Design a protein around this ligand. Structure first.
Ligand SMILES: *C(=O)c1c(COP(=O)(O)O)cnc(C)c1O
Ligand SMILES: Cc1ncc(COP(=O)(O)O)c(C=O)c1O
Lengths: 371, 372
């Protein structure tokens, strides 16, 4: 990667903007690994994590399906040539006009957690196949979601009866434990709860066939080897949904998107005060680094410039380029001394990075280089 | 405003996106008031706060100047036809390529707070007139700035000497106490420290003539009149420390002018009621026009467009943004009349750090704009 990025800069000596270096081959390899790790689980990629056109085309060609959250994301995936039949509108709150658009296009599987949402479906998308989303938190996930979405245990039967009353087909149950989860017990308990909800749906008169395990998993790699979350999920699947008549799906975002890209950024400013080395980059928490704010990320850059093995590290502060004092990429990191014009890159910067860009202060521009 | 927004909706029956309703006349009136409040102080509008083109043109035509933070902001202002002499590049950290752009465009005044910044000026824009930015904090400001910008007291003399050594003209001193400030004492202290810095610059051999009091002020209105709690004491500090007619005083206000420029209308698209708690999902979000909820701890109350009886029951409500993120909550708890899917509401005074911070996260973030 160091050589690749150095070669890009040598080939484009005029490069000014920060830039993503993205590798479709990494994602293809991870898809092949998903298949080995989760042989029963069909991934519906969470488009919202990273909507890069090349990435979406990459998945499409590898028979990965899609999780879309809005009409705009539906449009993106259709434009790539994917069948609307491969999309789940896995957002429990959908506008009337997005629902009409979904129906027209052929996006006819969606999630819900409210009776008012069922009223909307009845009126505007009556044959949409519905997945009931239930609340099942991992208290240790980086990003929490349980208050805002998913049905409470006490309302599962009421929602299912209400759907039956409106002649709405409920074909499954989903959950999301939280984004950025490394708690395998959270998935186990969620799948157990899902089986209970599944049984309540049968009790009510539905004929459900989909377990949807949501997202939240990392593709954690130690020593070039993907760790096997998957083992415990597959065990819960076997314990609670052993029947081959059940279709299992997931909504992974970060699993595939995280390692897709690195982000290269330049030191554009410098200030040294009483032993502390402060640097300003042509990036910010309002650009590709919103994860610093929302996921408490503390990223360490890789220097493109070679330094000897015994280079002195100095205490460094990495600031974003905006006016704002909250916009700090890393408050304290030991690094070799950097200089205005030095390029660095942050590994594994493909998840919830480029999708969260703003043009605040007139910044936020970046280029993208493929392979 | 309630009637204005209803008339917009009646005239545009197909309206689906959230929309800002923006009024140049409100800003024109506030410019006139600024003249009264601050008769010695030339405002350089902080374009980062709201870069709406109509807004920028309204300010251009009212002889208000500009504070640009980047090459893109410089571009926006020049394309409006504003003379380069009216722009201060008031960002102490500027890319070499942005400095080269500023030089091409005629943007020949900027701020700094580091010796390496002077190295860049010397090499790339040696004719640029420099304003030394000093750290002077309002600890009660909504958005803190001092950590990241402004020279410390013990480095003021060395930075000035360094500029002198490089043959760089230092023509004044600036500070920003922090954004969203209601502390008049912070300004008085900052202006005092600025005079001390100003005198150090004269001691070194510079000929400064500019005080730049930065930004931070709200246009706080009660009963149709702007409060002078901040202006009065800022003027008292100016009289104490910079009474000389030979000193030009400027400010970098953003929110003062932008805050009341717009309202943001948004629709109820989803509803859930559980155990007497009324939850609503809107076609807006904290990743859209509502970043202030996160970064400024805003707790915004919407105005209903639908008329309700004077004794109509309020219910406890939760106002959710349209994204899949749990952090995306507009208001955690607010008492309101029951709402229904299709109801429009609007948020008053929603022009400062609102539309400029929009993202397309989840495929949302789109909005329309109506003027007057
Ligand atoms: C913003 O932090 C900022 C402004 C404008 O602040 P207000 O909108 O008036 O609160 C002006 N100048 C600088 C250097 C800023 O960073
Ligand atoms: C409904 C839903 N599915 C999937 C995801 C993807 O999450 P992750 O990128 O952690 O796998 C999210 C994100 O919060 C989500 O809300």
């Amino acid at each position: 990667m160091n050589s690749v990025v150095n070669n890009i800069l040598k080939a484009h000596p005029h490069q000014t903007k920060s830039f993503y270096v993205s590798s479709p081959k990494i994602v293809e390899d991870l898809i092949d690994q998903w298949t080995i790790l989760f042989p029963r689980v069909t991934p519906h990629y969470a488009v919202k994590c990273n909507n890069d056109e090349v990435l979406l085309k990459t998945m499409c060609d590898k028979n990965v399906n899609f999780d879309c959250a809005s009409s705009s994301e539906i449009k993106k995936v259709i434009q790539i040539g994917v069948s609307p039949s491969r999309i789940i509108f896995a957002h429990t709150m959908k506008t009337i006009d997005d629902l009409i658009f979904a129906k027209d296009q052929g996006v006819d599987i969606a999630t819900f957690d409210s009776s008012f949402e069922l009223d909307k479906i009845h009126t505007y998308h009556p044959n949409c196949k519905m997945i009931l989303r239930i609340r099942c938190d991992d208290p240790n996930a980086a990003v929490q979601l349980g208050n805002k979405f998913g049905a409470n245990e006490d309302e599962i039967r009421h929602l299912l009866e209400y759907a039956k009353q409106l002649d709405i087909e409920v074909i499954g149950i989903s959950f999301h434990v939280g984004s950025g989860s490394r708690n395998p017990e959270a998935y186990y308990r969620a799948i157990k709860s899902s089986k209970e909800a599944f049984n309540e749906a049968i009790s009510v008169g539905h004929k459900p066939y989909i377990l949807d395990i949501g997202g939240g998993l990392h593709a954690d790699i130690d020593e070039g080897e993907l760790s096997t979350m998957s083992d415990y999920i597959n065990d819960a699947i076997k314990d609670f949904f052993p029947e081959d008549t059940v279709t299992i799906v997931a909504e992974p975002g970060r699993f595939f998107a995280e390692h897709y890209s690195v982000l290269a950024t330049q030191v554009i400013g410098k200030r040294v005060r009483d032993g502390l080395y402060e640097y300003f980059f042509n990036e910010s928490t309002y650009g590709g680094f919103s994860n610093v704010i929302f996921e408490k990320s503390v990223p360490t850059p890789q220097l493109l410039r070679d330094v000897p093995d015994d280079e002195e590290y100095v205490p460094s502060v990495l600031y974003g380029c905006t006016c704002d004092g909250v916009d700090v990429i890393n408050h304290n990191v030991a690094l070799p001394e950097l200089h205005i014009g030095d390029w660095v890159y942050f590994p594994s910067w493909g998840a919830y990075t480029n999708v969260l860009t703003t043009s605040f202060n007139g910044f936020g521009e970046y280029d993208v280089y493929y392979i």
